[PDB]
Amino acid sequence: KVFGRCELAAAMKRHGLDNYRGYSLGNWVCAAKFESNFNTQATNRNTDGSTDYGILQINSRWWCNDGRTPGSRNLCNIPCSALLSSDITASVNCAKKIVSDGNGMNAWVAWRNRCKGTDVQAWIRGCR
Ligand SMILES: CC(=O)N[C@H]1[C@H](O[C@H]2[C@H](O)[C@@H](O)CN[C@@H]2CO)O[C@H](CO)[C@@H](O[C@@H]2O[C@H](CO)[C@@H](O)[C@H](O)[C@H]2NC(C)=O)[C@@H]1O
Numbered sequence: 001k002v003f004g005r006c007e008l009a010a011a012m013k014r015h016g017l018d019n020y021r022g023y024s025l026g027n028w029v030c031a032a033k034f035e036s037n038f039n040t041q042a043t044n045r046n047t048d049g050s051t052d053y054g055i056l057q058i059n060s061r062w063w064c065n066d067g068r069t070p071g072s073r074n075l076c077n078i079p080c081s082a083l084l085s086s087d088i089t090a091s092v093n094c095a096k097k098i099v100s101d102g103n104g105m106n107a108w109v110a111w112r113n114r115c116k117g118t119d120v121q122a123w124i125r126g127c128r
Pocket of ligand 1: 035052056057060062098101103108109110
């Protein structure tokens, strides 16, 4: 599913991401925008043999199991395909673990390069 911007904001807010680990809702929306363009089905392969999955491009070397990634830790204890669901619950629960692990949202490369330091609140403009 391709979420609308405010639709995703509302889902993320309901799931407790607004200010989770001190990151305002716009940070999370901005991260999803540039990681997946709001597409829950997005997948992308990386050079180390891992793949990124879903709305928040969660990586299979660390967080989920896809059965084909060398050195995979599966720290969210979930199959990577669960992170492609139209329901963002699993991705949110896993993202909460990721952002709590020491480097905050720097875990998301697109967030660091395209969101960090910017007017991220603009990503929730007009949303109710
Ligand atoms: C969301 C996520 O899974 N983040 C990973 C991060 O994934 C990137 C990947 O690096 C890119 O090549 C493609 N897109 C993904 C999402 O933007 O990868 C990081 C390492 O490259 C990883 O950070 C490591 O996390 C573990 C567990 O928290 C730590 O123990 C390490 O210290 C982290 N290593 C570094 C260098 O920060 C993200 O979790």
